[PDB]
Each structure stands twice: as C-alpha cells, then as structure tokens.
Design a protein around this ligand. Sequence first.
Ligand SMILES: COc1ccc(Cl)cc1C(=O)NCCc1ccc(S(=O)(=O)NC(=O)NC2CCCCC2)cc1
Ligand SMILES: Nc1ncnc2c1ncn2[C@@H]1O[C@H](COP(=O)(O)OP(=O)(O)OP(=O)(O)O)[C@@H](O)[C@H]1O
Lengths: 1422, 19
Amino acid sequence: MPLAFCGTENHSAAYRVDQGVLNNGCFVDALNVVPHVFLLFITFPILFIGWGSQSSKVHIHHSTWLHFPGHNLRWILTFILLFVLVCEIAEGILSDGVTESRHLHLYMPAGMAFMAAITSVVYYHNIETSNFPKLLIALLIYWTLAFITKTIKFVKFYDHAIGFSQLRFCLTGLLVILYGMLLLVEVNVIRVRRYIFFKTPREVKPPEDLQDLGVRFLQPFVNLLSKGTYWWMNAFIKTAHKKPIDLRAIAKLPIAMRALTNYQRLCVAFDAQARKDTQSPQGARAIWRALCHAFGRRLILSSTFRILADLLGFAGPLCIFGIVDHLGKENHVFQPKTQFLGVYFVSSQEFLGNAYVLAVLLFLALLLQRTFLQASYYVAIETGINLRGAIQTKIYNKIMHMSTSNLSMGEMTAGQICNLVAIDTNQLMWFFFLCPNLWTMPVQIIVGVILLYYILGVSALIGAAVIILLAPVQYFVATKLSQAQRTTLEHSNERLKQTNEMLRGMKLLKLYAWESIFCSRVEVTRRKEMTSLRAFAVYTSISIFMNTAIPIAAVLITFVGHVSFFKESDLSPSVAFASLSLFHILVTPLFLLSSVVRSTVKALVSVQKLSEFLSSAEIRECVQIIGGFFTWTPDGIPTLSNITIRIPRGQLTMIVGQVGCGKSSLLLATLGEMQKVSGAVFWNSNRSRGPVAYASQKPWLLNATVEENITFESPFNKQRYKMVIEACSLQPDIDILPHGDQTQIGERGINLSGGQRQRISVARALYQQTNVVFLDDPFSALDVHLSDHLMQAGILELLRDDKRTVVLVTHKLQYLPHADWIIAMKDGTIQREGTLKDFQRSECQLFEHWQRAKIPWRACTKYLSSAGILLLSLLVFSQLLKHMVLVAIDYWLAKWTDSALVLDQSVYAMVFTLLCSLGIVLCLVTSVTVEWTGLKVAKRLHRSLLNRIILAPMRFFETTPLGSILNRFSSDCNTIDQHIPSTLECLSRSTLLCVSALTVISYVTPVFLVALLPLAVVCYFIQKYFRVASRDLQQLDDTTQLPLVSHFAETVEGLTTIRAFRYEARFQQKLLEYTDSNNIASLFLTAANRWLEVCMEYIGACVVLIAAATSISNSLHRELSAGLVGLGLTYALMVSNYLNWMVRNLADMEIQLGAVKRIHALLKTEAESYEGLLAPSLIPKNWPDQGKIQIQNLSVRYDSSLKPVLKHVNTLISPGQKIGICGRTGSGKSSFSLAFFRMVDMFEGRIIIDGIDIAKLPLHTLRSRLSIILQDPVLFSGTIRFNLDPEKKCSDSTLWEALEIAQLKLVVKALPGGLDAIITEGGENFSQGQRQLFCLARAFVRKTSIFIMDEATASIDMATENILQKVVMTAFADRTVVTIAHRVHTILSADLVMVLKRGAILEFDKPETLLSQKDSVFASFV
Amino acid sequence: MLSRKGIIPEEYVLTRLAE
Ligand SMILES: COc1ccc(Cl)cc1C(=O)NCCc1ccc(S(=O)(=O)NC(=O)NC2CCCCC2)cc1
Ligand SMILES: Nc1ncnc2c1ncn2[C@@H]1O[C@H](COP(=O)(O)OP(=O)(O)OP(=O)(O)O)[C@@H](O)[C@H]1O
C-alpha cells in the first residue's frame, strides 16, 4: 500500500488508461504537474547563477531599477492566485482524507503550482532588477503552457458533468481565468517594450529620481510587496545602529514629494478653478475645492485600502464563530457526500465549515487586513505631508506680496503668522491623516452593529448602545480636557516669562540678596498653574477610565441581558467569543472617532484662518516721481503727497526734514512698496527695478552668524569685508560678543545692544555691491560721533571709487548744507530738490547754524524621588490586580459557556457580575493612581529645580548660557507634567495586556511556548532596531521644524529689506530647501513607524496561526471542551496590536524620560553653600556703618587653575573717604568688581569688613547691607514698591522720600499708580536714570552704608550729571563708597584712588592731584 | 490604549529657545 500518485484502491484501477488518455481523471492532474516542474527546472540555474553574482559583486545592487509595463497588476494576480492555491491545498487535503489510500493527485499539483508561482515571481523580480527582457520568454511560454493544461482539466470537468455544485470546479474556473489574464499581462510586455519579435526595441531608462546620487527614501519606486511590507527600510534601519542618522544620511527626496512639485500641482488647481468659476476671491470654498481636486487621486486610494481593511477585519470574529461552532457538537460527520468517478469532491459547505481550513483562512485574512491597513495609514500620511509642503510654500508666496500697511501688517504681527504656519497647517495636515476615518469608521461601526446582531441577538444591541454612548462621553471629556489644557498652558506661559525675568537678572538679584524672595514670586504663580494641572489630571483620568471601563460594562450588560433578561438562545460558546472579539475591533475606532470629529471642526476653522490670510491686501503689481501720491489705506488720504523729486545716478543725497514729516514714506515710495495712486516712477539703475540696497530705521538681522548677517547670502571676499569691518568700527563690535564671526548674532542668540544692532545693519547696506544704497537714519541712535563721521566720510569715499548713488535721510544737519543735492520734506511734501545754494535761497540754512543608552537608571531615579513608595506600591499593585481580574472575567466567560453548551448556571452569571464589578472598580483605581502619581511628580521636581537653580553661584551663570537653563526648565517641565503620566498609563497598560495575553495563549495551548521562544527573540530584535532608529529620527524631526518657523519669523519681520534688494528668489529657495529637509525627516519617521508596525503585526499573525492550529488539535482529541479555545482565539487576535503599542509607547517613554534625565543632571550642580562658621549674629554689627573694609592681599581666582589676578592689595576704605578707584578696564576692573562682593573664589589673603571676619558671616545678611549699581540695568517686573524693596516692603512714606529726593519725581508722581503700580516688563519707556534712582532708594532704605558703583553703559550727559548729583547725596547720606568707572575721563573726583593694571599695586594717589603730577598714574589719566 | 495614535497636535506658543 505505498505512496501512490493516483488511488491505490481497486488494485490500481485508476491507472487504467483505457477510455481515452485524458478522460482518466488522474492523468489530467498528472498533466498539471508538468508545466510547474518545467519552470522550476528551467529557472533554478538562472536564479542560482544570479544569486552567486551578487555574492561576488553587490556594490551596485542599489543603483537603478525599471519596472516593466504592467507591473502592479502582475503582483496582485500572483497574490490572489496564491490565495486560491492555498484553497486548493485545503480542498485537496480535506477531499483525499476520506478513503483508505493516500490519493496524491488532489494536492500534489496544487502544491507544486504554489511553489511554481512563488518562483515565477522571484524570477520576474530578478529580471525586473536587471533590464534583460528577452529572458522572460521562458516565463511567458510557461504561462501559456500552464493555461492550456488547466483548460484541459476544466473542459473535462464540464464533460464529466460536475457543474458548479462541487467545489473544485469553481476554484478551477477561477484559476483558469487567473493564468489566462496574466498571460495577457505578459503579452502586454511583448507589445510595449517590443523585444522579442520586433525589428527595433523600445528601450527605456530608469527614472531621474532614482538615478540621482543620494536618494535613500526609495519607496515610490519599488515593487508592490516592498511597498506593502516596507522591505527597503531594512538596509536603512539596520544601518542606523552602527552610524547615527545625520541629515546627510537621510534622503534628498524623490520628485513626487518635492515641495516645488506639489506647489506646481496645487497652483494649477487654483488657476483652473478661478478661471472656470465666477469666484472673485480665492476664498474659503476656493481653497477647499482646490485641495480635493489636487490630492483626491491619492486620498481615495487610502480610503479604498481602509474600507477593504475594515471588511477583512470582520473576517476575524466571523472565523472565531465558525471554528468554535464546529468545535462543538462532537465533530460528527467529517466526510464528503459527493462521489464523482470514484473520487470525493468536498462540498463547499463542508469546506468553509471545517476547522483547520477556516483557521488558515483566518490567517490569510489577517495578512491582508494588517497590510492594507498599513498601506492605508501611509498613503493618508504621505498625502498629508505633501499638503504641508505645498501649503507652506503657498503661504510664503503670499508673504512675498504682503503690504507693510497699517491695515494689512497693522492687524497681524509676525507672531500671528508664525502660529499660522505651526499650529494651523499642522492641524490641517492632521485632518488629511484622519480623512479615511470619516469615510470608513461609519462603515466599520455599521457593519459591526449589524453582524453583532446576527451572532448574538438583541442583547448585543443593548451592548452596542453602551459603546455607541461611549463616543459622546469621550467627546465631552475631551472638550473639557482641551479647555483645561488651554487655560493651564496660557497660564504657564506667564510663569515661564516670569521665570525668564528672574533668571536673566541673576547677578543683579543676587547682589541685593534677592534670590529667595524672587523664587517665592515664582512659586505663587506655579501653584496657580498647579491647580490648573490638577484639573487637567482629573479630566485625563476619565479618558483612561472610559477607554478601559466602557467595554467591560458593555460586556457585562450584554451577557447578563442575554441570559437573565432575554432567556432566548443559551450559550453557545461560539456566539459568546465572537461577540467579545467584535467588541475589541469596535472599541478601537470609537474613542478615536471622537478625536476625528475634533479634527474636522479644527480643519474648517483652519481653512477659514488661511483664507482670510491668503486674500488680504497685496502690495502692488534713476529716481523720478512726478505726481506725488502715496497712501497706506488703499483709497483716500495720501499720507505723503506732492512728492516731485528726481535723484539720478552719480550722487550722494543727504536729506533733511521735520520730525515725522513723511521721511521713510518718501524712501519706501521710491522702493515701490506703497500703493501710489497718482503718479509715475521712472527708474533706471546705471520700467524695472535694480537691486536697491537698504537699511531701515528699525534694524533687522537674520538669526545667524555675524558674517552671515553682513555678507547676506552673497559671496565673501576678505579685502572688502576687512575694509567694511574697519570703517564701520566692527572689530570692537565683533569682540564685544564672546565669539565674533561665529556667534549667533541678533535675536534667538547673543543678546545685543541698540547701538550695535544699528551699526550692523549699516554694514550690510554698504557691502552688498549695489546700484543704490539707502541709509534711513543710521546716525540717529549711534551716539558715537566719530564713528558716524568716519562712516560719513567712508561712505562718500567708498561710493566715489564705485560711482553708485547713496541716500541718507536723517536730521543730522552737520553735513546737509555742505556737499549734497539735498531735498527737504516740509509737512509731508517736497519743497525743493536741488543744490545747497538753493537752500541758501529759501531761508532754511538757519538751523544748521543753530551613547544610545536608555531608561532604567534615569527611570528608577524618576520614579523614586518623584512618586514616593506609599503611592508607588499602590500604582503597581492596582495595575497587576486589575489585569488578573481581566484574565478572570474572560476565563469565567469560557468556563460558563462550556458547562452551558454540554447541558449551576445562575451562579455563573452572578459571579460574572461580581467579576465585572471588580473590573470597573479596579480600572477606576488604576486610572486615578497613574495621574495622581504624575501630579505629585511634577510638584516636587519643580520645587527642587527652582531651589537648586536659586542656591547656585553666579559663576555657573557665566559658564552656561541663559538659553540652556531656560530650555531644560520650561519645555522639560511641560514634558514631565502632561506627557509622561499619560504615556505611563498607556505603557503600563500595553505591556501588561501583552504579558496577560501570552500567558493565556500559553495556558490554552502549552505547545505555543516552544514556538513562542524563537518568536519572542525575533520580536525582541525588531524592538531593539526600531528604538535606535526612532529616537534619532525624532530628534531629526524636532531640530528641523525649528529652523523653518525661525525662517518665517525672520522673513515677515524684515520684509521690506528683502523686497528692496529684489533678492526674494534666494529666500524662496531657502524655504524650499528647509521644507524638503523637514518632509524627508517626517517621511522617514513615518516609514520607520510603519516598518515596525508591519513586522510586529505579522509576528502577531503567526501567533494566531500557531495558537489556532494547536488549540483545535488539542480540542479534537484532548477535549479542551471549546470554551477555552474561543478564549484562546480571542486573545490571539489581540496580540497583534499589543506588541505594536508596547514598542511604540516604550519609544515615546524613552524620549520623554530623557527630559527628566537632564533635569537630574542639572540638579547635580550645587555650590555656594551658606557657611557661616561662627556665632552668626556676633560676627557682624547691626549694620556696618564704618565702611572700614580694609582689603588685605585678597588674591582672586575662578577655577583656581592657572592665573590669579589680584595681588597683595592692602587697601582700605576710610570712613567718609569715598574712594573712587578706577583701573585698567582690560584686566582688573570687571574681575575685581565681581569679586568685591564675595562672589568669586578668593583663595587666600584676608577680606576684612570693618575689621571683622567676612569669611564666616551670613551671606544673606552680608549681601543685604552693601548696595550696588550696575552697568546694563534691568527692572524686574512687579509692583513699584516691589521694585523698591521687595524683601522689606516697609512703608509708602519711605518710598515718598525715595522717589522724590533721589530722582524721578516728575515721573513717579505723574505715574497713574504711584508706588503701587505694575512695572510693565521693566519700565519700557521710563528712563535710564531710574537705575540710579533705584540705586539711591535701596542705598538709603536697606541700611546700606557702602555703595559699590559701576559706570553707565549708555546714558545722557545730564543723566550722568544727575547721577553725579545723586552721588554727592550718596556720600552725604551713606558715607561709604568704593567706585570703579569705565568712563575714565570723569572718574577723577574721589579722595584716594588706585590704578591697578595687569594685577599689581602700580599706582596709588592718596591725594587726587598727585596722580596728575607723576609719570605712570598720569599716563593712565592722560 | 493609544495616545500617539490620538491627536498628537497640541498648542505650542512657547518654543525651544537655544543650546
Ligand atoms: C493607528 O492610528 C489609528 C488607529 C485606528 C484607527 Cl480607526 C485610526 C487610526 C489613525 O489615526 N489613522 C490616521 C493615520 C495615522 C495616524 C497616526 C499615525 S502614527 O502611529 O502616530 N505615525 C505617525 O504619526 N508618524 C508621524 C506623522 C506626522 C509627522 C511625524 C511622523 C499613523 C497613521
Ligand atoms: N510703513 C508704515 N506703516 C504704517 N504707517 C506709516 C508707514 N510709513 C509711514 N507711516 C505713517 O506716515 C507718517 C510719516 O512717517 P515718516 O516717514 O515721517 O516717519 P519717519 O519720520 O521716517 O520716522 P522717524 O521720525 O522715526 O525717522 C507717520 O505718521 C506714519 O504714521
């Protein structure tokens, strides 16, 4: 009885070749073996020679691809003929398993056809990579050969009169037209590329996007299986573990996603609509129609994949119902009825009612659901990202035409348009991510409600009414959540600005011993934010609570209704577990549908925002102006008219005019940026415009290097840059910043001063090599007179050797009647534009003669010092107890259904209610404990970060910038307050559900764990490589969308400078490079996420296959009783999207715990301990009023490394002798001024204080009674009485003495509040003398005898005189001073003085006149 | 149990400053 091919019954009577050769029903299957082994045995030498040549030379293996025409339908026909060949294997096994013999002619041809079709697509792939089309002649003669043999078999089935009743007739007719239809695909290749029989072949090249050198993101040009399963990602993602992902390692990007290309497509759509339609604006509906018209051809494709993914989703619970129903009722028949020609044909009802066949059908349904779902995700993502590209370029195109009016720009500042780019366009992008959901998620829910009613009955409609009343509850909780988050975040903005004003003036607040009191003024605002954050935690626990206790209450209400209330159709375990798995596939879209509805409302609001922006007023469509009309409102009232002035080439026009008489309007009207109503503009550079150089009254600099704001995207030569840096006095300006030509100048970088920024803008105007140069008052704020004179003489000299026009419009009348062709604007009109002698004839000259490590160190430190074990134990215990209860509620359903099908039943229902009650109660406990632990976490970490940043030396603030401390304060507190606890609840639910699910799978099938261990290893490595790639692409996402919104700020601010140069096109390309570097980082983050999700979900599909096969096998024989088996299969389906969530939430927890690692690292910088090593009240007096601090040889250092400065200075301040001691400003001025206050490391010597020990004094009390003034003053915002004395807050009459008799009386008494008004962020237009007024106020009120002074940086001469008069009052009232003043030409008035240059005792003059008589002290005074 | 699959977009007025 050996392995016969045909039947071994009737003594080999099925081999009788009589009655025809083909009418023997086994010989036709013998024919079908022939073409498949023909292809294998003609394409094994081809494939192995090909595979060897890649093992010799594989460098060019990622170079150039060309798919043959008809490629996508080739692959989908191979997949669906693979599907039906698996079905004929299933039919063949189930038909031949009814007789005594083996009957191998039912599943030898189908099995070898399966391997032949797989090898016929590997051969096609190895011939599509290498353009050699004449070698797939073998494959087309295969398909015509295989089509003929199944044509033989099908027409003999019609002649043996099977008909469509038996199953293999239907399948064979289906796969006859399969091989026929892709044979027709093969002759399409013959027809198009014309290689076989045609005299001239058409030869195509690989496309230009592939042939470019660096393109890594090769997803739009790869075969269909690699688009489905992201196989190309592997060579990228495995590379990411050796070398990190630099921005050169990411792609350039393909042509289909370049920001210019999507912008072209979107502009074609807008132009086509506005021509054919009668819409006068391109308003809201116009933009809305245009986006759909340009991107519907992809968005419909994403929705198509999503609908197919939804239907193949419901072939999961349907397969559980079929499996468990057949696994009940004894497995009685297991044999086919039909017997045609002695062979048994399986009836199709017996086919799709079998156990293993329906299980393999379940497996193949999941490998198509969970691949079309991922293709649906990515196509929705990729079309959304191409909206980000085209809409940012569209917004920026209408930045390049926006007028700087008082109505267009006078309404919306650059903060509005930066928030427009960021918030608005991202939520419009998020609408096109969620766009297939509003087309499919209703079909998902509707087909879900319908077939859940067919499975169970009307009690399932009570259950479906519960979950369909869990979408509005999620919506209203999310609405209250967004309200609370709105109020909390715009409250903590005020807290972060207050912390910025308390951490910028670190030296000034530490000098008056005011780090503790200002920390309290921060802590009060923090606790108001903490109340708002507690409301955030309440409204986000209920989202967790509803997500994890609406389905349990739904299941409890469902089955208790069906048995107690209904008594209609008793379980039937198949009915119960099909209903459970349907509830999980319904619970996922429901909570997310609330977020979809939110995104739809925001999308409509967002296109409204972007429509009123896009259709606001534009600007418009040598020098000569005739008509003289120029306005800002686009009709009526010209703000500068009667302008009839001509300034041709070869000129340097100094201009003049009144204060606010239309000066900048006149210059900008020549610039063509004003809507000139009446008049013409003749224009010719030595009517179209040349690159007019310009520098506005308000300065402007790109947030870049100082040379980058000087050369301004132009070539760089050393000679002209050195001359412009010398003439504009820029070498002291470069040295004024600690890096010069590498420091990030301007805003977002090194904080400059007003004179410095005005001089930098003038430098960019001269260097840019232009046929005109406009200087709109450069010498207005720059009070350095000789700088302006050298600039004036140097501007004339530079342009005279260049022969190009200049125009300087200001009131600097020192040169205006001398050597210009001047023009004067009186009352907003032109009087005379001529020579200086004409102004000597119109009465106007009178005025000029008048690692890659991770969590567990940082996560342990986070959980310990933040939570506290009295709640850490409650959190971990409640999660584990809730999940044992969830295993119990599922297992109790299984045990009750087994004992109900084979028939204490009300006992089962009652204990089911008392297990569902524990489910809801434990989920509320876990939902409260996670968010409450996170709330307490943020409280103690914020007080620790504030106190350790307070209890720090000022030397640390010299080392690290204010940018680093403010960033890891504000943004990282946000991450550890509102993002880590929600991620913690999601992570502690996701990994615990996975351990729960695999314990249950291993419990039902103890064969699984042997097949789990290699599967868990593969799951572990996929997890490992994804973390390495996802972290690096995440930082590459963040640090690339930052410079782009930086660009949108820096463009809208200095708009008129860019349109002046006609250098708009270079900034257009800078955006497009930034947008390409953003979209390629965003697309790699998307495609790496999909590679994880496809690969981990296939691992989940293999879980389903192994679990279902071993469970049914152990329930046919070992009698599992099928209650457990349904409980097995309904968790095998849920594994596939718990491994996904475990790995993704672990990656998000990684990046977010990295923002608590940095806060602990910055808590690790502690110094300046308040060490009073005596009896701390006996060492000082009540207040030191001697002023007799004899400094004794106090030698200074900071790091104590290589160079002390102060040496042997045995110098005393006598009581009364207000010793103004100036020295060398290069070495010993600023260092000594800081170290005088015990704010530096005096490593030796003796620093006395009135003869007492100032090394063991209370440093709070020591820094209390010794006042100071500063060089660059700043006012901490608050009350004016808080600006005078926050630690005291003594009385108003002390403030009356202060704010009258010191200074500023006609500002304080003329203020609206007085001493109790809010200092509006520093006193933005108060004075510079308020610094000295606050100095004298704090010197008389805080018992301050000493007053250590520094010089004014920028002040008025009368303000310096008023400071001198207040200094006379300071000696008369405080009697102790030791002053150093960098304004050296005025610092001679003292009693005794010492000039101590380069760290020595070099000059001493106890009378003041002896310094001016001697040699060395006079030379520093000459 | 999905938060990143939810609407990740939130309000961002203050940004990362420097360093
Ligand atoms: C996985 O979600 C769902 C689960 C169930 C349902 Cl019924 C709908 C969705 C859903 O929301 N479908 C929208 C499409 C979607 C949304 C989020 C995600 S993702 O997993 O967050 N991957 C990323 O976001 N990549 C980002 C994209 C933005 C720039 C940076 C990279 C992936 C795809
Ligand atoms: N770009 C503009 N946006 C809004 N209003 C403007 C603009 N330019 C001019 N104006 C209006 O035109 C009038 C004349 O301004 P003018 O050109 O005299 O300023 P300016 O004198 O150059 O400035 P400054 O006096 O500071 O040098 C002003 O009252 C101003 O309100």
